[PDB]
Structure 1
Amino acid sequence: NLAPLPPHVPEHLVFDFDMYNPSNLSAGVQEAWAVLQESNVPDLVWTRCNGGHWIATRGQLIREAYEDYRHFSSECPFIPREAGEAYDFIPTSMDPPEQRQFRALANQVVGMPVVDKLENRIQELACSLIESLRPQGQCNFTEDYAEPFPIRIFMLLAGLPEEDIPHLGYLTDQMTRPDGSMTFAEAKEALYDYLIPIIEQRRQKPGTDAISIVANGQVNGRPITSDEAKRMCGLLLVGGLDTVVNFLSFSMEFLAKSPEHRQELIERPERIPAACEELLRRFSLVADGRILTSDYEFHGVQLKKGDQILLPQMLSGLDERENAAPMHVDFSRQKVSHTTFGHGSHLCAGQHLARREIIVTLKEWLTRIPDFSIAPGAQIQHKSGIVSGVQALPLVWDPATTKAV
């Protein structure tokens, strides 16, 4: 279902990539996006899929565009257009300098000092979930660990009841990987209708949870509005529920297939932080973008005002111009170059939380269950969208080779 080619786009720049269903998905989602980096494809192309939009395919262009918010605005950062237009999360729907005072409040609530404060709980929950699974000799990693570990920590941080998880998980899925049951607008409104009473309750009687802090914070000398707090909390929910969850499945699926990579981390745990970076590169999973604020010529290509451009955070680290043998996982890379948490002013606010969750998962899983694999015959399906993911991940192991700590 292609949209008619706009008159300003030359035919040689056409490449009909569908970000929500790439043709190569059976081979792995990162591999499916990497077709955009074969020699037949220009640096910057127009797809007629999903309403019609640009895609930058090279790390250099993606970084440049994310830096230049003057031409590439966050006002409409999602494809398709209806989703980008409905999208009003704070601070991600704002350009500098407006984004600034909000970014600082996001940092207050999900930044380093909060992570450092919650580290014990993070550690506690990983060990608990893992020990609980360990003697089973099998699990569905997506539902058995990948979801509850990051999500319960986020609900803990936000002071929200775990009973609300399935509902919230549904709405977030719809926003990043639309199935078609509901528009982005409807999904957002459902999410906001959940947030609205909570925020109100918390402006009246402040707590110490992230939502209380946001809803009672200050921006530009004045109190945050109930509407702004809602737009900010909505983003935090999305980030909390649908990023690390999906990334953990990619990493664990990989580790299920490489005993030598496992042993590398088991023998020298100080390598785990670098390994985290490398897995973040190889299994990068986000792709949003920007909208053109005016007519602009960018690397020889005529862009028109209102044109959307997808700037896949996923592609920069897979670009062979940034990393040699990009599809190989090499914990010893002298520089892991990537933009997995993004680039420019909107560089992920929760990246420290995410790394902590990944680093804890790697160490605690490999300690107790050093030897595991994918269930025999099992076929792993990836899904693609604004955030790519794993449908299911059946793992198996012999409990005789596992360890309680």
Structure 2
Amino acid sequence: NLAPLPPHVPEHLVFDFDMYNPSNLSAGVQEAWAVLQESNVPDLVWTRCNGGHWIATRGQLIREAYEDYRHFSSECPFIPREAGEAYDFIPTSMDPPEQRQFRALANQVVGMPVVDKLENRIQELACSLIESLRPQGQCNFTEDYAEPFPIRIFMLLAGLPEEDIPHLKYLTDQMTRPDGSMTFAEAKEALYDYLIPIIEQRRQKPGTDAISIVANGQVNGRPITSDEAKRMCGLLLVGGLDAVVNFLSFSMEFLAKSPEHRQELIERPERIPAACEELLRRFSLVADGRILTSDYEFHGVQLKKGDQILLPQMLSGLDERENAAPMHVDFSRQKVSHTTFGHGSHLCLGQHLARREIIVTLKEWLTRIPDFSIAPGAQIQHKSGIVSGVQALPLVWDPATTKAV
């Protein structure tokens, strides 16, 4: 329902957008969020949905707010407020200067040096999964590739058993796109409960996996505590099991419906990295925010201490003020502007792993299954939330048109 409009929020700035169930969802989730960028919509609006909160609708404000951590704090980064208040993941719930010592440790476990090391394994897994699907002439992309490819790689990095994925994925799903079975707080508590004994076990018998590295790590010279390790490992799990998975599906859904773009990458594979970036812009999918630390006038609007403001990372790149004909996918786009991996001090630490996974997928899939389409009649459904996603993606193809490598 709609929360009563607070006395300080101008009546004319009200736009009741529901980030968990946008009205234009059937047209595609990015299209649904883009309604916030239609002709008569202000740069900053207030929605009475989900408890009531501000929403910056243009890249200019989104970037500015993410850069000003003194006014826009990460302490309560999720909407609804109850979720944001329970949210204590490290380093994401912290603002600089406190954030830095923890972010450095996190970067060491998922950063570029680590992705370089996972290269061959990422490559091998992508190829094995695709080769097994190839002769079948069909697949449920979300469950047969989007999920197993990146998640198995992350579980390998974290040294966690793959049989634990169903439980962990159910929990992360409730934190980003809740179905109602669990509140954010309940899902977080369950994720922490899962981690507690594992962290204790690896602090006693350290391994070479990500959890061991975090649990036995140091933060600017001093030993990390068990609680801190838990709050950081929980965040790494959420980061590695959701966004990339859903992004792969948005991208493949698009390629399945646009033979022309597939052909472009088939004929010119060297354009894959650039295509990856353009797809990251067009099918951006994350949207979290910040909380006002004090009363502050921002772009002519009076924000009050405690107000929550959603700063959709997804919207910057779809903003026509940042990219002409934003809804059009142009792998040759000159200046691909976006904040898909965030902006400011909290820039995504797993973006290098994500780009590698996306590029590897595009290359290895198009090489074996150049021609494919969405199952006839299928009405693809998207879901909206902190991280938007694709419910299911049934694909089909003629095995005769494929080739083994």
Q: What is the TM-score with the length of structure 2 in the denominator?
A: 1.00
Once residues 389 and 52 of structure 1 are traced to their aligned partners in structure 2, the CA distance between those partners, rounded to angstroms, is 23
- 1:159-170 residue pairs with structure 2 within 5 A? 159-170=159-170
Inter-partner Cα distance in structure 2 for 1:354 and 1:32: 25
How many residues are treated as equivalent by the alignment? 405
Distance in 2, matches of 1:231 and 1:43, equals 34
Partner of residue 232, structure 1: 232
In 2, distance between residues paired with 1:266 and 1:156?
A: 31
Q: Following the alignment from structure 2 to structure 1, what is the Cα–Cα distance between the partners of residues 99 and 272?
A: 33
| Deviation by residue 1:303-337 (Cα, 9 ceiling, x = unmatched) | 00000000000000000000000000000011100
How far 1:123 moved relative to its partner? 0.2
TM superposition shift of 1:80:
0.2
Per-residue CA deviations over 1:128-170 (Å, capped at 9, x if unaligned) read 0000000000000000000000000000000000000000000
Aligned equivalents of 2:212, 2:394: Cα separation in 1: 38
Which whole-Å CA distance do the structure 1 matches of 2:25 and 2:63 have between them?
A: 25
Take 2:260 and 2:361, find their aligned partners in 1: how far apart are those partners? 18
- 2:383 is aligned to 383
Residue 260 of structure 1: how far off its partner (Å): 1.4
Q: Distance in 1 between matches of 2:202 and 2:263?
A: 47
Per-residue CA shift, 1:162-203, capped at 9, x if unaligned?
A: 000000000000000011111111100000000000000000
* Gap regions ≥5 residues in structure 2: none
Measured in 1, the distance between the counterparts of 2:127 and 2:65 equals: 41
Q: CA deviation at 1:39?
A: 1.0
- The CA distance in 2 between the partners of 1:270 and 1:231, in whole Å, is 40
Per-residue deviation, 1:221: 2.1
Aligned match of 2:142: 142
- Per the normalisation by structure 1, the TM-score is 1.00
Secondary structure of residue in 2 paired with 1:321: coil
- CA distance, structure 1, for counterparts of residue 86 and residue 58 of structure 2: 28
CA–CA separation in structure 2 for the residues paired with 1:105 and 1:222: 12
1:53: Cα distance to partner?
0.1
Q: Deviations over 1:237-261 (max 9, x none)?
A: 0011001000000000000011111
The aligned counterpart of 1:310 is 310
Determine helix, strand or coil for the equivalent of 2:145.
helix
Aligned CA-pair RMSD: 0.5
Aligned-partner Cα distance in 2 for 1:115–1:19? 32
**Distance of 2:40 and 2:191 partners within structure 1:** 42
Could you say what secondary structure the match of 2:208 adopts?
coil
Deviations along 1:341-387, whole A, 9 cap, x unmatched? 00000000000000000000000000000000000000000000000
- Give how far 1:266 is off: 1.5
Q: After TM superposition, give the deviation of residue 267 of structure 1 in Å.
A: 1.8
Whether 2:166 is the aligned partner of 1:158: answer: no
Partner Cα distance (1:374, 1:265) in 2: 18
Unaligned segments of structure 1, at least 5 residues: none
Output one character per residue of 1:195-229: Cα deviation in whole Å (capped at 9) or x when no partner: 00000000001000000000011013210000000
Deviation at 1:263?
A: 1.5
* Structure 1 residue 243 corresponds to structure 2 residue 243: yes
SS in 2 for 1:297: strand
SS at match of 1:291: strand
SS of residue paired to 1:348:
coil
Quote the Cα distance in structure 1 between the aligned partners of 2:310 and 2:99. 20
Q: Mean alpha-carbon deviation: is it higher for 174-183 or for 78-87?
A: 174-183
Q: 1:264: Cα distance to partner?
A: 1.3
Cα separation, 1, equivalents of 2:47 and 2:41: 12
Aligned to 2:17, the other structure's residue is in SS state coil
CA distance in 2, matches of 1:367, 1:182: 41
Identity %: 99
1:295 aligns with 2:301: no
Q: After TM superposition, give the deviation of residue 270 of structure 1 in Å.
A: 1.6
1:290-313 deviation line (CA, Å, top 9, x unaligned): 000000000000000000000000
Secondary structure in 2 matching 1:207: coil
